[PDB]
Amino acid sequence: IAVGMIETLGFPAVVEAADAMVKAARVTLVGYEKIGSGRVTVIVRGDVSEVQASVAAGVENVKRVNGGQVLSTHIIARPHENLEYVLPIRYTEAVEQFRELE
Amino acid sequence: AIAVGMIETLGFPAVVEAADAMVKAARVTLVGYEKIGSGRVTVIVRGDVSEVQASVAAGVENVKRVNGGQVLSTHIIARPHENLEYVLPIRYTEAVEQFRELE
Amino acid sequence: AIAVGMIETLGFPAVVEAADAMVKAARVTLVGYEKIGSGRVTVIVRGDVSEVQASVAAGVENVKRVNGGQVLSTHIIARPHENLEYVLPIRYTEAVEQFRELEH
Amino acid sequence: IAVGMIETLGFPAVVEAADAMVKAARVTLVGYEKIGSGRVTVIVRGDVSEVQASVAAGVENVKRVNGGQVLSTHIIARPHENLEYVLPIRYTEAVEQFRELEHHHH
Amino acid sequence: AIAVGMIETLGFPAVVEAADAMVKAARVTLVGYEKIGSGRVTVIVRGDVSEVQASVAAGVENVKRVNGGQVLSTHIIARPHENLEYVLPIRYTEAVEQFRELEHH
Amino acid sequence: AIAVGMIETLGFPAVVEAADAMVKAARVTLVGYEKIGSGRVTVIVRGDVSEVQASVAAGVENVKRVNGGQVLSTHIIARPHENLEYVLPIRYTEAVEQFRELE
Numbered sequence: 001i002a003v004g005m006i007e008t009l010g011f012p013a014v015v016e017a018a019d020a021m022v023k024a025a026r027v028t029l030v031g032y033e034k035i036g037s038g039r040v041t042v043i044v045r046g047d048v049s050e051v052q053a054s055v056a057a058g059v060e061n062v063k064r065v066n067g068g069q070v071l072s073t074h075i076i077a078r079p080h081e082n083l084e085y086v087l088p089i090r091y092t093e094a095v096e097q098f099r100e101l102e
Numbered sequence: 103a104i105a106v107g108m109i110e111t112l113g114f115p116a117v118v119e120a121a122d123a124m125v126k127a128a129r130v131t132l133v134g135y136e137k138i139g140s141g142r143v144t145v146i147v148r149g150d151v152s153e154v155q156a157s158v159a160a161g162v163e164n165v166k167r168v169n170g171g172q173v174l175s176t177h178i179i180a181r182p183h184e185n186l187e188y189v190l191p192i193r194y195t196e197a198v199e200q201f202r203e204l205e
Numbered sequence: 206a207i208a209v210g211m212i213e214t215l216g217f218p219a220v221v222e223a224a225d226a227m228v229k230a231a232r233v234t235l236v237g238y239e240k241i242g243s244g245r246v247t248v249i250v251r252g253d254v255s256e257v258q259a260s261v262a263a264g265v266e267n268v269k270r271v272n273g274g275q276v277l278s279t280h281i282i283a284r285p286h287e288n289l290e291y292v293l294p295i296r297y298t299e300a301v302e303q304f305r306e307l308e309h
Numbered sequence: 310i311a312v313g314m315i316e317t318l319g320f321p322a323v324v325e326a327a328d329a330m331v332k333a334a335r336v337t338l339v340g341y342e343k344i345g346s347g348r349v350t351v352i353v354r355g356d357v358s359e360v361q362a363s364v365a366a367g368v369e370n371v372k373r374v375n376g377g378q379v380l381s382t383h384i385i386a387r388p389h390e391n392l393e394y395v396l397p398i399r400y401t402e403a404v405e406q407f408r409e410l411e412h413h414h415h
Numbered sequence: 416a417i418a419v420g421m422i423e424t425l426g427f428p429a430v431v432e433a434a435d436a437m438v439k440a441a442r443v444t445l446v447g448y449e450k451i452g453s454g455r456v457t458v459i460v461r462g463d464v465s466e467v468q469a470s471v472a473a474g475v476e477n478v479k480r481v482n483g484g485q486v487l488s489t490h491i492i493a494r495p496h497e498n499l500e501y502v503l504p505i506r507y508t509e510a511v512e513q514f515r516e517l518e519h520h
Numbered sequence: 521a522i523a524v525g526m527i528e529t530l531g532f533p534a535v536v537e538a539a540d541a542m543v544k545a546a547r548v549t550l551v552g553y554e555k556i557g558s559g560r561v562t563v564i565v566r567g568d569v570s571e572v573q574a575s576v577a578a579g580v581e582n583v584k585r586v587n588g589g590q591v592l593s594t595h596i597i598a599r600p601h602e603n604l605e606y607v608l609p610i611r612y613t614e615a616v617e618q619f620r621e622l623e
């Protein structure tokens with residue numbers, strides 16, 4: 001169950017990134033992380049090939065944000081279980097309904 | 103359309119002006135204000151896609167009147183996937199529903 | 206309607222002076238102090254629009270005299286839409302209700 | 310009851326600024342405020358003439374801090390009552406023993 | 416003595432890759448994620464010192480595969496003083512207990 | 521007088537090294553870790569003034585050998601005024617009482 005991530009500079013772009021990712025494939029948006037200096041990341045979980053398609057769409061679609069900018073992106077095909085318990089990449093009760101349709 | 107419209111400014115006074123202009127210019131509801139550090143704050147409206155287009159364009163014009171204001175980014179999402187409302191601050195909150203209840 | 210006026214400064218001492226000068230210059234209530242990171246802070250006052258206009262002028266002039274003070278932006282909205290009060294920190298709160306009455 | 314403030318870049322300078330202020334005159338250190346970009350402010354209250362002396366000393370001492378630096382300072386002699394309900398400059402319970410020791414001039 | 420290894424990146428996707436490479440490269444425990452503002456975030460692993468050296472070596476190497484990745488700083492303390500845990504966010508916690516049990520020594 | 525020693529660094533790994541080298545160098549207690557944003561983080565030790573002087577000097581040297589650490593500022597106050605502890609994060613807590621006893 002891969003994890004996919006798009007970090008942008010600026011909030012409107014991260015919202016476009018989120019929207020494009022879940023529309024382009026069967027992935028679940030599981031969170032949004034702010035780390036300062038305007039850098040915010042959206043995080044999806046799903047089958048790796050779905051996640052790869054999501055992230056590509058997300059990256060492409062930030063291009064249509066006026067002032068949007070992608071700072072970094074990464075996919076991990078098979079994240080180690082320890083990561084879920086420390087980093088905010090885990091599903092929450094709030095998004096359980098979407099994890100279903102994957 | 104249940105579009106979402108967003109304007110991100112540098113500076114708080116400009117963002118208050120962007121929100122005030124957007125809700126005056128069309129039938130949209132201001133639902134959120136997000137800070138992501140570094141002086142960047144975004145206000146978020148929801149409504150019909152053509153109303154949101156008008157709001158965002160008005161917000162951008164009106165921030166021009168602000169002494170020291172600046173728009174950093176804007177965007178409209180025409181049909182926000184239902185997953186977004188659960189993770190990102192783009193939904194009506196109880197406070198805004200109080201406002202809407204006055205009608 | 207009740208106008209809203211705001212002065213945003215780079216530095217906390219300057220924002221305290223801005224607030225102090227605003228409430229002393231005219232009949233306005235200080236209702237908000239907003240921090241958005243990176244040293245940028247804003248004080249927000251509410252009152253009749255002409256009082257708010259006098260206050261904000263006073264605030265900007267007194268910041269200029271703070272050792273290290275700097276105003277980054279200022280703005281006045283004569284008739285803020287009612288939706289704003291439910292989302293942005295511009296509203297009167299119970300803690301400043303006493304000063305609201307002093308306005309009139 | 311005046312309010313005196315020194316904003317520094319960096320936290321060790323702000324602690325020195327606080328220490329020099331309360332040692333130089335009978336005022337009370339009531340708080341410290343962080344607003345991002347490494348800017349932190351310490352805040353004292355007291356009689357205006359005592360606060361003047363505290364702030365002068367805090368500014369002198371911060372110059373001895375390895376790497377520290379004052380960014381801004383300011384004293385408001387007779388802060389309006391409204392300020393206290395919105396800005397973080399209030400006395401708190403925790404410092405009332407020092408408030409009692411302030412020297413006032415009538 | 417249980418070493419502590421740290422990799423600080425500018426940006427969240429790189430920190431997540433650093434963490435993943437660290438726990439895959441050796442038998443250590445990822446115990447924390449610290450944000451200090453300005454984009455700087457750190458991940459912290461604990462375990463035997465030769466394992467922590469391999470984890471930290473691998474996290475640093477894997478951050479290069481992150482598009483837009485940057486490592487800002489890295490450090491390993493072989494035998495961290497006992498005071499450190501009670502003040503700094505480097506402690507083991509219940510949430511990662513299952514992974515501490517799997518550590519190599 | 522229980523003196524107070526501080527080292528502020530750029531970056532979390534360097535602050536952990538600063539802390540570590542300080543409590544290893546002399547008889548002081550690590551009581552505090554303060555973040556003020558912009559990557560600036562400060563660690564705070566308490567102890568006898570001559571013990572604090574040695575801790576701070578060691579912490580500065582060891583920080584400079586960290587990969588990417590910088591010492592942004594340091595300072596030592598020999599006899600901090602009583603008022604400081606009720607306002608700033610420099611006091612002992614229960615959590616490190618065990619190490620105070622050891623000075």
Ligand SMILES: [Cl-]
Pocket residue numbers: 297298299300
């Ligand atoms: Cl209230």
